[PDB]
Amino acid sequence: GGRLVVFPNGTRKELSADGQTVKVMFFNGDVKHTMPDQRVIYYYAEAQTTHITYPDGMEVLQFPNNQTEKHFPDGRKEITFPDQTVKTLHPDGREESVLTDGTIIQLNPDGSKVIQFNTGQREIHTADFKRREYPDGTVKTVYSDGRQETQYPT
Amino acid sequence: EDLSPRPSPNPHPVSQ
């Protein structure tokens, strides 16, 4: 079978017979599990937070307010808030939030915003105009100078 | 050889 080691400071280390599974129970309540598949699970007792590191670089954090975060090796971060909104942060600077009703809110580095409503209509906000596309094919644009243009469908 | 715990985590600061 395995082996148990108890350190004078109270930290305990359990090792499986093959040594591929190691569980460290730190004196402060934290727990670290090293698995045979090389993933490392760390539990923070004070913060009640779980942190999983994968061999490919992926990291997952789970908070006690039911917030979860995924840090991808390519730089992408995905946050799932307690209200189940999902916010993705991309390496190129863009941000996308997906609401529970299916609405998508895209923030771009150039200051523009694109909203795709659950209704199929898209709305675009730029420095020069606000534009709303309707699924019947009509488009209304309100320019910065105040003029309003409605394009009717064919 | 070092089995001392990690420091406390913090949620990645969000706008909303």
UniProtKB/Swiss-Prot annotation, chain B:
<comment type="function">
    <text>Plays an essential role in early embryonic development. Plays an important role in the regulation of centriole duplication and directional cell motility.</text>
</comment>
<protein>
    <recommendedName>
        <fullName>SCL-interrupting locus protein homolog</fullName>
    </recommendedName>
</protein>
